[PDB]
Amino acid sequence: TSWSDRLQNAADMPANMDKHALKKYRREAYHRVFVNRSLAMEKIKCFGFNMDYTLAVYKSPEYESLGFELTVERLVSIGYPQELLSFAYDSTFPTRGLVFDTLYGNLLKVDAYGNLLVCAHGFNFIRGPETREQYPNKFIQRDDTERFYILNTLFNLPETYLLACLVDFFTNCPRYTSCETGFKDGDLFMSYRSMFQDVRDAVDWVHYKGSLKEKTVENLEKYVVKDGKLPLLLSRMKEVGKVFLATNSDYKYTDKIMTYLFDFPHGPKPGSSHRPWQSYFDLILVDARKPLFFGEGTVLRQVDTKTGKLKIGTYTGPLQHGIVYSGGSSDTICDLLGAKGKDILYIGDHIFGDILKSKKRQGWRTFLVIPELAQELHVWTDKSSLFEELQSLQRRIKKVTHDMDMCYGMMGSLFRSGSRQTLFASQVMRYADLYAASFINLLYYPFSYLFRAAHVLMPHES
């Protein structure tokens, strides 16, 4: 039972819009919207979306396995050894939000302050005392972006595992000599940094020059969560305000995916005429290039929706019905919809590119979708006893921490290691006004709902 099984199980259910059914449903953690800062829904005038991993939630582990397989095949084709073909994606290894240290070839799970929570070299988990050789203060400088790479998105799960597989392979293959910063193969030296770059380039290639999109689109039922409640929620949003799409994906792919997401023999509710996905949006913008989108952005272009090509030149015209934009900036959206930042709720899955940047650059209201929550909540309740014991409680503390963590997978919870919160957890709390397993959870609240969080007090004020 992956997080995507959980999401698809809830997706299969019809919406009971009886006001009491709705209130009962949203009491369950799975169907709840969680609140970091208070947000009055009645003040929201524009609901903004992205597509990948928000509207189109890719099924796990099938989609990660496909990305992994195609990335391996690309590395082998550029000259990596044939033994790579014997790797197989393992969903129990990677947790999202890990930091790859390109100098020493380690995956790290860190807190908000750069403190080490977990360090793995290949599949070797390095204990407290041994990490001090490479990390004398058990600490990384995360402003050192050339050295440290943060694996923020669900698209990064295959490479998280592949990095560990590669380091394990080269370490244990007698053709190679292990050094501090990479591997010697006779008169060839491959640094962890250059290996990392090859992996990053191959993952980018699979998505943009390779066959990943084609293989996804040819079996959408295998690869993409589908939910009859999506059209219903969007239609309700459009009754109270404007709705926009801002996606980093291109028009042709967006069209294929979005057509699938709305392919039911009815419109918003059973019995109603089907309508095209585009009719659900007041503004459609592709090739957004977020987070640059929230600064200067790029030149505003118009998509020719017949050919899927961009028209030549900068688009200087007004918002018209049926127009589709490419590039531009967040200011494009604000200007065209007559919105200020605080009128906008932007629904995203990218903690940095969607949420942190829209909040800090533009003062947008934010809703973070965390698909793994759909299964992390089950574990959190089902093992509440272990956490409770940890709260009560030194070598027992380390042991309980390990056993708690192992319930989530080899790299632990997305949100913590024992009693220490991760960097990802802290950025969620800081930048996401609201968060949930799925944006569909908004269906279960009335549109004048006041999401409330308690006021914060300093220690001297308490």
Are the C-beta atoms of 226 and 11 separated by less than 8 Å?
yes
Site for ligand ATP in 135-164 (CB under 6 A): 142-143, 145, 150, 152
Among 101, 159, 349, 372, binds Mg ion (CB under 5 A): 349
CB closer to Mg ion, 22 vs 112: 112
Q: Which helix (H) or strand (E) holds 232?
A: helix 229-240
CB of 143 to ligand ATP, least distance (A): 4
SS3 355: helix
SS3 content of the chain, % helix, strand, coil (to 5): 40, 15, 40
- Upper half-sphere CA count for residue 93 (Cβ side, 13 Å): 24
At its nearest, how many Å lie between Mg ion and the CB of residue 290?
9
CB atoms within 10 A of CB 39: 21
10 Å CB burial of residue 96 (0-12, 13-18, 19+) is buried
Give the angle 339-343-348 at the CA atoms, nearest 5°.
105
Q: 224, 221, 214: which is closest to 57 by C-alpha?
A: 224
Cβ–Cβ under 8 Å, residues 259 and 224: no
362 binds its own copies (CB under 8 A): yes
Distance from C-alpha of 293 to C-alpha of 301, rounded to nearest angstrom: 13
Question: To the nearest whole angstrom, how small is the minimum distance from the Cβ of residue 351 to its own copies?
Answer: 14
Question: Of these partners, ligand ATP, Mg ion, its own copies, none, which one is at the site of residue 359 (CB under 5 to 8 Å by kind)?
Answer: its own copies
Least Å distance between CB 128 and its own copies?
13
- Give the three-state DSSP class for 183: strand
Complex with its own copies: residue 47 or 435, whichever CB lies closer: 435
Residue 352 binding partner per list ligand ATP, its own copies, Mg ion, none, with a CB distance cut-off of 5 to 8 Å that depends on partner kind: ligand ATP
Return the residues of window 332-351 that contact ligand ATP according to CB under 6 A: 351
Nearer to ligand ATP, 142 or 252 (CB): 142
State the Cα angle at 256 between 251 and 261, rounded to 5°: 120
Residue the block writes with tokens 């195609």: 70
The site partner of 145 among its own copies, ligand ATP, Mg ion, none (C-beta below 5 to 8 Å per kind) is ligand ATP
Contact 93, 412 (CB under 8 A): no
Q: Of 385, 391, 392, 394, which one interacts with its own copies (CB under 8 A)?
A: 391
The residue nearest ligand ATP at its CB is 143
Instruction: Check if the beta carbon of residue 383 is closer than 8 Å to that of residue 407.
Output: yes
Picked from ligand ATP, its own copies, Mg ion, none, the partner binding residue 53 (CB below 5 to 8 A depending on kind) is Mg ion
Site for its own copies in 258-317 (CB under 8 A): none
Tell me the window of 66-74, 150-158, 174-182, 417-425 that interacts with its own copies (CB under 8 A): 417-425
Of positions 14, 128, 270, 363, contacts its own copies by CB under 8 A? 363
* Cβ proximity to its own copies, 175 vs 452, nearer residue: 452
Would you say 220 or 390 has its CB closer to its own copies?
A: 390
Place of tokens 């009754």: 239
Q: Is 444 helix (H, G, I), strand (E, B) or coil?
A: helix
Smallest distance from ligand ATP to CB 142, Å:
4
CB of 128 to ligand ATP, least distance (A): 23
Residue 27 binds its own copies, judged by CB under 8 A: no
Q: Is 308 left (phi over 0), alpha (psi -120 to 50) or beta?
A: left
CB 299 within 8 A of CB 313: no
Task: Quote the least distance from Cβ 310 to its own copies, whole Å.
Answer: 30
Q: Which helix (H) or strand (E) holds 151?
A: none
The DSSP result for 284-344, as a single string, is EEE---TTGGGTT---EEEB-TTTSPBPSS---S---TT--EEE--HHHHHHHHT--GGGE
**Binding-site size, its own copies (CB under 8 A):** 41
Asked if 448 interacts with its own copies (CB under 8 A), we say no
262 is an interface residue for Mg ion by CB under 5 A = no
Rounded to a whole number of angstroms, the minimum distance from the CB of residue 154 to Mg ion is: 8
Q: How far is CA 247 from CA 111, 254, 458, in A?
A: 30, 8, 39
By CB under 6 A, name the one of 112, 292, 334, 425 that touches ligand ATP.
Answer: 112
Contact between 50 and Mg ion by CB under 5 A: the answer reads yes
Pick the binder of its own copies from 139, 189, 208, 447 (CB under 8 A).
Answer: 139
Binding site for ligand ATP (CB under 6 A): 112, 142-143, 145, 150, 152, 351-352, 360, 427
Binding site for Mg ion (CB under 5 A): 50, 52-54, 349
Binding site for its own copies (CB under 8 A): 29, 32, 34-36, 113-115, 136-139, 141-143, 340-342, 359-363, 373, 377, 380, 391, 415, 419, 421, 425, 428-429, 435, 453, 455-456, 458-461
